[PDB]
């Protein structure tokens, strides 16, 4: 409203939302409208095209697909942890489990999955598979599906994790 007052000379203002995939741009637009006007899904890349939503008479909101700026220091593990990609279409998801175990505190994972006593990531996946019945033919653990479940819970706010702010 303050920006609209500052641009009262113009007929309206356009407010475009940008950011990474799955940060909540369409969710923010829906919250501001008070109505589900933009499609919302926890999978990355739900919004594919630019969309105008008339918030008020002089405020338009522009939904945009998420972007990932190319950096030479970014790892595919880093992109998958920041939520760029869908974990169903990646090869060997168990390699990203050590990154999740580094990011998430151990006690948070223990209270999340009611599991304790693993020595490394593949042991954790096997124990959780045997606990949850993720078994293939012959009763072997399904560490691939368990890794996909853990990655999806990490992405969609089911496991607590955050980056602490730098101290002054």
């Amino acid at each position: 409203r303050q920006f609209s007052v500052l641009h009262k000379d113009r007929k309206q203002i356009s407010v475009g939302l940008i950011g990474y995939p799955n940060v909540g741009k369409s969710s923010i637009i829906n919250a501001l409208r008070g109505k589900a006007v933009a499609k919302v899904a926890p999978i990355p890349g739900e919004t594919k095209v630019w969309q105008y939503v008339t918030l008020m008479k002089r405020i338009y909101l522009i939904d945009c697909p998420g972007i990932v700026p190319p950096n030479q220091h970014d790892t595919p593990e880093d992109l998958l942890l920041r939520g760029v990609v869908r974990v169903e279409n990646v090869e060997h998801p168990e390699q990203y489990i050590p990154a999740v175990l580094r990011k998430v505190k151990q006690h948070h994972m223990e209270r999340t999955y009611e599991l304790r006593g693993w020595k490394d990531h593949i042991e954790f996946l096997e124990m959780l598979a045997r606990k949850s019945g993720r078994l293939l033919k012959g009763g072997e653990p399904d560490v691939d599906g368990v890794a996909k479940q853990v990655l999806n819970d990490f992405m969609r706010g089911k496991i607590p994790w955050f980056t602490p702010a730098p101290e002054p």
């Binding site: 948070h108 994972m109 209270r111 999340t112 706010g157 089911k158 496991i159 607590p160």
Partner: peptide
């Protein structure tokens, strides 16, 4: 902008946050 008042914001009560 105004004063940032996050005191009345209730965080999400996840499963891992319960003892």
């Amino acid at each position: 902008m105004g004063k940032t008042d996050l005191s009345k914001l209730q965080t999400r009560k996840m499963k891992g946050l319960k003892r």
